[PDB]
Swiss-Prot record, chain A:
Species per Swiss-Prot/TrEMBL record: Saccharomyces cerevisiae (strain ATCC 204508 / S288c)
Domain notes: The MPN (JAB/Mov34) domain has structural similarity with deubiquitinating enzymes, but lacks the residues that would bind the catalytic metal ion.
Entry protein name: Pre-mRNA-splicing factor 8
Function: Functions as a scaffold that mediates the ordered assembly of spliceosomal proteins and snRNAs. Required for association of BRR2 with the spliceosomal U5 snRNP, and the subsequent assembly of the U4/U6-U5 tri-snRNP complex. Functions as a scaffold that positions spliceosomal U2, U5 and U6 snRNAs at splice sites on pre-mRNA substrates, so that splicing can occur. Interacts with both the 5' and the 3' splice site, as well as the branch region. Has a role in branch site-3' splice site selection. Associates with the branch site-3' splice 3'-exon region. Also has a role in cell cycle.
Taxonomic superkingdom: Eukaryota
Subunit structure: Component of the U4/U6-U5 tri-snRNP complex composed of the U4, U6 and U5 snRNAs and at least PRP3, PRP4, PRP6, PRP8, PRP18, PRP31, PRP38, SNU13, SNU23, SNU66, SNU114, SPP381, SMB1, SMD1, SMD2, SMD3, SMX2, SMX3, LSM2, LSM3, LSM4, LSM5, LSM6, LSM7, LSM8, BRR2 and DIB1.
Mutation effect (R105K): Severely impaired growth. Reduced growth at 30 degrees Celsius. Strongly reduced growth at 16 degrees Celsius
Record gene name: PRP8
Additional free-text comment from the UniProt record: Present with 468 molecules/cell in log phase SD medium.
Cell compartment(s), UniProt: Nucleus
Region (RNase H homology domain): 7-237
From Swiss-Prot, chain B:
Biological source species: Saccharomyces cerevisiae (strain ATCC 204508 / S288c) (Baker's yeast)
Keyword annotations of the record: Cytoplasm, mRNA processing, mRNA splicing, Nucleus, Phosphoprotein
UniProt feature coiled coil, ranges: none
Protein name (Swiss-Prot/TrEMBL): A1 cistron-splicing factor AAR2
Region feature (Leucine-zipper): 244-265
PANTHER family (UniProt xref): A1 CISTRON SPLICING FACTOR AAR2-RELATED (PTHR12689), PROTEIN AAR2 HOMOLOG (PTHR12689:SF4)
Disulfide feature: none
SUBUNIT field: Heterodimer. Interacts with PRP8 (via RNase H homology domain and MPN domain), competing with BRR2 for the same binding site. Component of a U5 snRNP complex that contains at least the U5 snRNA, PRP8, SNU114, AAR2, SMB1, SMD1, SMD2, SMD3, SME1, SMX2 and SMX3, but is not a component of the U4/U6-U5 tri-snRNP complex.
Positions bearing Phosphothreonine: T257
GO cellular component entries: cytoplasm; U5 snRNP
Family note: Belongs to the AAR2 family.
Note: Present with 7330 molecules/cell in log phase SD medium.
Length: 237, 300
């Protein structure tokens, strides 16, 4: 059923599974009109579909042309997400298709179930975890490809860089969620922590800097301090 | 007017006939029900005094044969049987009538309740939902499961209602996933009406039969079917006007007849609130909405 803190190691077993996060699919800026009314302008978005065991991220870029002439866009966005995830599954070889898809928001359950009726053996599940995947657009290389897109496009990334050569997928997911939670809580400070030292660079083929094992421990500590610092600022603690 | 005689009444029992009921004492000289209106199906139903478990009963049409009730002490229930000897039957009824051992079907002349509840219900359609081809009448009880309930266990004792499932390939055209899920008109009009039921009269007949089995037997699967068939119409943006007007009449009389104290168990809050206040047809069921708001405002 639902995926929570009791069954957390299930994410790193050998049954193929994908998280689907739709929080950046339909993105707008709200603005005033010449007459003083309010209107929205869409900007390019993305579906965040991630295999937490391998780091495999299928970033389907949602170009603003998708929304042209359509009504009820926040509702449509859920069905468009489900349509695209269904199309991704069908594009994968049978032995690569997931056995479970975990949606980060419960409103995606019915759209995805309906689009996946042809796959009765793929379980569609919610989660009780509060995952920070909305912050994916705070990763500079991901935001760059989304904003530059001029048409619908799928881009592939290992979101763990080469970390799995040195750490387990449980630890890599923990590092990812800590980084994303930090970027969500205070984007400017998190990017300062990650890029403050000019001698540590991001490889051309990577998303995150090339930290040594000991440097990652320092970075991880600085991210936890940031999250706690912001918590105290928010609640006056 | 027709008659269903009883051989005897050996166990104390509450007997229903359509929307009426009466109590018979153990070994009371009760020998049946007379003056049953010709032209409608009827249901004769039982709840034993010493074990209210299992309400059970029989749907029948006196135009199709001469039927009587006799208690079976081995199986422990009142059984309907058909008498093929026409002259024996007439002679039996006449003696019981002369001795005044029968209750009269107590229909008030002004009262169209039973017609309004069974307008589209036909025995031939009942006999396809309830499969026992050697009899002209159909047994139903409180515990019988539906074909759909069995898919989610004896097949011969099942209620073969038409399966309705909103998240099924039958309900959802490939490529129209959002459209068909949010507006069920395709599933209602093409799949169910044109395809399976052939016309709205058969659809309403099954809806009405499901309601009556829910009400008279407490049959849970029948209640599920009744609500599904309502929801399917209310969740469709395109419904013929004559069907919406007839549905409003059907539901009005169902809600009017429901025991006030059985509302908690026979009415689904989600379906009714969705149907009356959110669905495409929220403004199409004027009579039903008025009776629901005056009779069961708590549910809403
Ligand atoms: O193997 S990958 O990590 C992969 C990610 C998603 C599907 S396959 N990869 C393929 C080449 O582009 C870079 C990322």
């Amino acid at each position: 059923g639902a995926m929570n803190s009791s069954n957390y190691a299930e994410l790193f077993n050998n049954d193929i599974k994908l998280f689907v996060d739709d929080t950046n699919v339909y993105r707008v800026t709200v603005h005033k009109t010449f007459e003083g009314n309010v209107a929205t302008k869409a900007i390019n978005g993305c579906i965040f579909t991630l295999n937490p065991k391998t780091g495999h991220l299928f970033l389907k870029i949602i170009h603003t042309s998708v929304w042209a002439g359509q009504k009820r866009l926040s509702q449509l966005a859920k069905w468009k997400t489900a349509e695209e995830v269904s199309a991704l599954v069908r594009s994968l070889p049978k032995e690569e298709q997931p056995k479970q898809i975990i949606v980060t928001r419960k409103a995606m359950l019915d759209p995805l179930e309906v689009h996946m009726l042809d796959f009765p053996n793929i379980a569609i599940r919610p989660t009780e975890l509060r995952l920070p995947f909305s912050a994916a657009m705070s990763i500079d290389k991901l935001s760059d490809v989304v904003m530059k897109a001029t048409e619908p496009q799928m881009v592939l990334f290992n979101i763990y860089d080469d970390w799995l050569d040195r750490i387990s997928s449980y630890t890599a997911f923990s590092r990812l969620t800590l980084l994303l939670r930090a970027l969500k809580t205070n984007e400017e400070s998190a990017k300062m922590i990650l890029l403050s030292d000019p001698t540590i660079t991001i490889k051309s083929y990577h998303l995150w800097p090339s930290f040594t094992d000991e440097q990652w421990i320092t970075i991880e500590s600085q991210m936890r301090d940031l999250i706690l610092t912001e918590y105290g600022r928010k609640y006056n603690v | 007017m027709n008659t269903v005689p009883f051989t005897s009444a050996p166990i104390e029992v509450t007997i229903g006939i359509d929307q009426y009921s009466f109590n018979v004492k153990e070994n009371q000289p009760f020998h049946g029900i007379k003056d049953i209106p010709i032209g409608h199906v009827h249901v004769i139903h039982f709840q034993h005094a010493d074990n209210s478990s299992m309400r059970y009963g029989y749907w029948f049409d006196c135009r199709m044969g001469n039927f009587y009730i006799q208690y079976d002490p081995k199986d422990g229930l009142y059984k309907m049987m058909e008498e093929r000897d026409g002259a024996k039957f007439e002679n039996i009824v006449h003696n019981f009538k002369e001795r005044q051992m029968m209750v009269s079907y107590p229909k008030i002349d002004e009262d169209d309740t039973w017609y309004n509840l069974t307008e589209f219900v036909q025995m031939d359609k009942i006999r396809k939902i309830v499969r026992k081809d050697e009899n002209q009448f159909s047994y139903v009880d409180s515990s019988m499961t539906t074909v759909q309930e069995n898919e989610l266990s004896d097949p011969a004792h099942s209620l073969n209602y038409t399966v309705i499932n909103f998240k099924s390939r039958e309900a959802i055209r490939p490529g129209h996933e959002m459209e068909d899920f949010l507006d069920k008109s395709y599933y209602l009009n093409t799949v169910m009406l044109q395809g399976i039921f052939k016309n709205s009269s058969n659809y309403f007949g099954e809806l009405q039969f499901a309601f009556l089995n829910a009400m008279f037997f407490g049959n849970y699967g029948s209640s599920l079917q009744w609500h599904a068939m309502i929801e399917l119409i209310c969740s469709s943006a395109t419904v013929p006007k004559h069907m919406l007007d007839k549905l409003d009449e059907i539901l009005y009389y169902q809600i009017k007849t429901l025991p006030e104290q059985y509302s908690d168990i026979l009415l689904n809050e989600r379906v009714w609130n969705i149907c009356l206040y959110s669905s495409f047809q929220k403004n199409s069921l004027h009579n039903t909405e008025k009776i629901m708001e005056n009779k069961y405002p708590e549910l809403l």
